[PDB]
Subunit: 288 residues, 3 copies
C-alpha cells in the first residue's frame, strides 16, 4: 500500500519530496512509539562487502529494534566471496538485503539479481548512501522544526564530498533553502550541483571561511575550515553542527560540549531513519 | 523422539532412507509450514573455522527461521589439541554445534569432545558435506516428484568432485535410476562408483556431449563443457539444471533465463534441508 | 536492592564482597531457573576490539540466554575503525549496554566517560582487568567448595603476568581467612603489591617449589598458562610451563579438591587429568554463562 513498499533504495535521487517526507514521518513515528515486533518473522542480510562499522551496527540495531533476525558479513576480506550470483543466492534466503559494496553501481546491479527482494544501499563505493542522507535530513528537521527556509552551510571537501552532494540535492527538493559553500578553491562544490541549484532558483554563495557565515546559519555541515568552540561566539541559538563522521582535526573536541554539537545525536538518528526505511519497505500497512 | 534426535550429523552415509526420507519430508514441511518458534530456547554455534559464506549464511538463516539464537565466527581451530579444547568449552555453552573445518577429520574429532551436544558438519575439508547432498536430493525430489526411476546426467569433473560421488551414491540407494556421465577422460567418474552401480544393476553410460542425452535427462547436474541455452532445445519439459555452486564458465548466463535453470532455486532449498536437520536433531517430534 | 543497576563494571576492585555475593547468588538463581526473556527488547553491543573467541561466545550466549539482541564486532581488523571516544560516543546512542574487550589498559574506563547512560562491561582491558572471569572463578569455587571463606587455594604457573590470579586473589581476600600457596617460576612470581596487600589484611600466603608439596592441603588448584606474548626477552626461558599437573599427582588430593584453569591451557595440565573427578576447568568455563548472565541481568534490570 505504502509508496515505498517492496522498493529498492539505491539512490537518494529516486526519492521524491513526498517520499522523503514519508520516511521522515515514519522515523519520527517510530522514535515516538517503538514497534519491537514490527518485522518479527523477517530475516535480513547485512552484507558489508567493504567494512563500515558504524553504518553496519546502526543498520543491524534498527533491524533488531523491529524484531527482525540478521545474517551477513562485515567485510569481504576474510570471506569466501560473481556479485550477480552472490546476490541471486542470498536473495533465496532473506527478506531484504542491506549491502555496502566497494564498487559504485554495485547496489544498482544487485537489484537486477535479487528477484523481488528489496536491496537497500548502505554505501556504494563512494557514490550513493541513501540512509546517511535520510538521517541527515531527519536530524535537520528535528532540530530545526522544518526542512524549508533554512540557511545551510557545507564545509570541507565539497568537490569530492558526496554525502554533501546528496544532501544538497535532497534539501533542494524543499523550498526556500539558502546555501553557503565553504571550501578551498581546489575542492569546491561541483558545477553540476551549482547548476542544479540554479535550475531550482535556489540561492547559493561561496566563502573562504566559516567566520564569514557563522552568524547566519541554522545548520553547519562539516567534512574533512576547522571548527573550534570559540568560532561559535556569534552562532544562532538554534544552530546545529553536523558531521556524517568520522571526524579528525576538523571539529575541535571543545566543540562537543557546546549546545551546537549534534553530530552524535545525528548519528543516533540513523536508527530511526533505518528503521523507517526497513518498515516501509517490508510492511504493506502504515505505521499507525 | 525422531531417529535423528540428539544425533551427530557428520556424513550423509550415516543416513538411511528412513532418515533421508524423514529429512526430506521434514524439509518439505518446513518449506510450506514454517515453525518460527520451534527452537526458541536454543542457542546454536555457527563455527566456520574456514570461510564458507554461502553455507554459513544459509545455515544461520535456517537457525533464525526456527527461532534459535546464533553465536559463532565466520572465519578463523588450527591444532587438534586446541581444537578439542575449543569444542569442549563451546559445548558447555550451546545446544548444538554447526561446524565447517578445512582439515579433514576435524568434524569427527569434535564429536569426541562435545559431550551431549550434537555436531553438524557444514563442510569437513573438501570432503564430507552432508547438507549439500541433502539439498541436492531435496531439489531433485521436489522438482521431479520422486527419487527413483530418473535419468540423471552428471557433467564436469567427476573425478575430483566429491559432491557428485555422494549424490550418485545417494541416488543409487533408489530404484530404476539411469546415469549419464559427461566428463573429460582425465576427470572421469571413479571406477569404484561404477562398480557400486554395477553391484545394483544400475545402467550408466559415458558421453562426449550434453547434447546426445539431452532428450532423455530429467536432471542435469553440472560441476566445475559449457552449458548453453541452445543445448537445451530438446530438453524434457520437466528437466532441471542443477549446480552445487559456485559456477564459473560451465553454465552460460543465457541458461539462467530458461525454465530449466534451477541452481539458484537449489541453493534456496539449502534453507529447508538445513532447517530439517536442525529441527530433527534438536526437537523430539515435529508432527507433520 | 540491586546496587549494581546501571553500573559500569570495569574492575573487580570496584566490587565489594556484597557485590560479589549478589552476583554469585543471581547466577545460582538463573542457573536454577533461567529467565529467557528477562532482557527481551534490549540490544547489546559485543565490541571485541581485541578478538577473544571463547570469551566472546560466552558473553553473547549469555545475552541470548536472557533474550537480548546482539550487535558487534569480533575484532578491529575486520572493522572500519576514528577515536575510541567517538566510537563509544556513537554506539552508546544505539545500544542498551556495551560489552567491550580492548587491547589497551584503561580503555573500558575511558569508554565510561563517553557512553552517556549506557553501562560499559569490561571483557578484558589490555593486560589489566577482566571482571567476569573473576566472577565465574568465584562462582565455581563457591559451588564446588560450598563457600568462599577459610579455603586453601593454590595458584600455579605464570603469576607475574597472570592478571586473573591477581584478580582472583584480591576478590578472595575480601572473604575471611583464605590461605594461599604460590607456585611460580622464580621469574614469573606473584607481584609484591599483591603480597603486601595480603600482609596488610593479615592473610597468610606461601611460596612453593612444586604442586606435590601442597597437594594434600588444597581445596582449589588454580592453574595458569604462561603469558607468552607478554614475556620479556630476559624471560624467554620461562616459556615452557614449569609446572605440569598430571593425573598421578592427584593420588593424595583432598576429595573436594577442584582443578581450575581460566583457559586456554597449554602444557600445564596434561590430558590425563581431564577424566578425573578433580578436573573442573570445563565446568568452570560453563559457569561463565551463569555469571555473565547474572552480571547483565543486574546491570540491566532494576529488580533482582
Ligand atoms: Ca513548507
Ligand atoms: Ca554516564
Amino acid at each position: 500500500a505504502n509508496p515505498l513498499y517492496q522498493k529498492h533504495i539505491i539512490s537518494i535521487n529516486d526519492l521524491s519530496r513526498d517520499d522523503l517526507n514519508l520516511v521522515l514521518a515514519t522515523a519520527a513515528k517510530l522514535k515516538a512509539n517503538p514497534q519491537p515486533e514490527l518485522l518479527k518473522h523477517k530475516v535480513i542480510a547485512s552484507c558489508f562487502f567493504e567494512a563500515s562499522t558504524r553504518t553496519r551496527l546502526s543498520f543491524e540495531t534498527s533491524m533488531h529494534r523491529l524484531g527482525a533476525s540478521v545474517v551477513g558479513f562485515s567485510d569481504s576480506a576474510n570471506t569466501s566471496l560473481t556479485l550477480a550470483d552472490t546476490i541471486s543466492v542470498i536473495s533465496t534466503y532473506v527478506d531484504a538485503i542491506v549491502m555496502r559494496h566497494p564498487q559504485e553501481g554495485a547496489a544498482r546491479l544487485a537489484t537486477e539479481f535479487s528477484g523481488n527482494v528489496p536491496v537497500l544501499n548502505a554505501g556504494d563505493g563512494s557514490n550513493q548512501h541513501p540512509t546517511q542522507t535520510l538521517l541527515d535530513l531527519f536530524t535537520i528537521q528535528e532540530t530545526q522544526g522544518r526542512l524549508d527556509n533554512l540557511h545551510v552551510a557545507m564545509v570541507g571537501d565539497l568537490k569530492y564530498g558526496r554525502t554533501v552532494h546528496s544532501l544538497t540535492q535532497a534539501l533542494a527538493k524543499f523550498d526556500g533553502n539558502r546555501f553557503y559553500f565553504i571550501a578551498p578553491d581546489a575542492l569546491a562544490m561541483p558545477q553540476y550541483i551549482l547548476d542544479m541549484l540554479d535550475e531550482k532558483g535556489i540561492a547559493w554563495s561561496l566563502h573562504s571561511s566559516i567566520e564569514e557565515v557563522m552568524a547566519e546559519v541554522d545548520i553547519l555541515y562539516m567534512t574533512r575550515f576547522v571548527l573550534r568552540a570559540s568560532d561559535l561566539h556569534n552562532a544562532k541559538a538554534n544552530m546545529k553542527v553536523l558531521h556524517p563522521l568520522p571526524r579528525v582535526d576538523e571539529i575541535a573536541t571543545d566543540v562537543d560540549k557546546t549546545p551546537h554539537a549534534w553530530y552524535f545525536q545525528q548519528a543516533g538518528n540513523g536508527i530511526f531513519a533505518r528503521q523507517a526505511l526497513l518498515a516501509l519497505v517490508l510492511n504493506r500497512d502504515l505505521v499507525l
